[PDB]
Curated annotation (Swiss-Prot):
Pathway: Organosulfur biosynthesis; taurine biosynthesis; hypotaurine from L-cysteine: step 1/2. GO terms for biological process: cysteine metabolic process; L-cysteine catabolic process; L-cysteine metabolic process; lactation; response to amino acid; response to azide; response to cAMP; response to ethanol. Monomer. Its EC number is 1.13.11.20. This is Cysteine dioxygenase type 1. One of its GO terms (molecular function) is nickel cation binding. It comes from Rattus norvegicus. Binds 1 Fe cation per subunit. Ni(2+) and Zn(2+) can be used to a lesser extent. It catalyses: L-cysteine + O2 = 3-sulfino-L-alanine + H(+). Disulfide bonds: none annotated. Induction: By increase of sulfur amino acid intake. Highest levels in liver. Significant expression also in kidney, lung and brain. GO terms for cellular component: cytosol.
């Protein structure tokens, strides 16, 4: 239970394997360790594979089945849908640039516009946390000049989620696709 500062991305991954060795998740400890890793671009360049038209999801580690650790690459103006996290934990740490996170409440079953609950700017090396009990969110790189890179941890791993239509609250099931795995492009 003794949290040391991760010296490198590899060290962080080793620490995460220790923190997820059991059946439950100490959220504050995981967030603290992710926050404490100082982004070093040389260590994650292998995973930072961008696409011109949308953000990419790049698998880094499968956590011995306990978590998916992935790097997301956001071109200028790239953003996500409003989405949930499939009854799992989601941690989001900025490795480069800034992302805007907008929080939404779960919609009522009547068709209505989803109104933002709040928003914040996540800055380099900050780590955010979300789960379905907190709400829904959208993540966006609103920069016109700076690509963003973020490090995401999902526990347990999940490969589907729901996207929500901001005008109605209607949801559709979406399959999560990986742009690359362990540095290898996976078309
Ligand atoms: Fe998310």
């Amino acid at each position: 239970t003794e949290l040391l500062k991760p010296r490198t991305l590899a060290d962080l991954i080793r620490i995460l394997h220790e923190l997820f060795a059991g059946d439950e998740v100490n959220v504050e400890e995981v967030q603290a360790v992710l926050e404490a890793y100082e982004s070093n671009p040389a260590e994650w360049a292998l995973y930072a594979k961008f696409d011109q038209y949308r953000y990419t999801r790049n698998l880094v580690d499968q956590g011995n089945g306990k978590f998916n650790l992935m790097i997301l690459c956001w071109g200028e103006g790239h953003g996500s849908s409003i989405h949930d996290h499939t009854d799992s934990h989601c941690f989001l740490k900025l490795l480069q640039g800034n992302l805007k996170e907008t929080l939404f409440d779960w919609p009522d079953k009547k068709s209505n516009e989803m109104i933002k609950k709040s928003e914040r700017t996540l800055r380099e090396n900050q780590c955010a946390y979300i789960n379905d009990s907190i709400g829904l969110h959208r993540v966006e790189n609103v920069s016109h000049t700076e690509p963003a890179v973020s490090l995401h941890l999902h526990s347990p791993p999940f490969d589907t989620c729901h996207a929500f239509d901001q005008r109605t609250g209607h949801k559709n099931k979406v399959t999560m696709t990986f742009h690359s795995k362990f540095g290898i492009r996976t078309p």
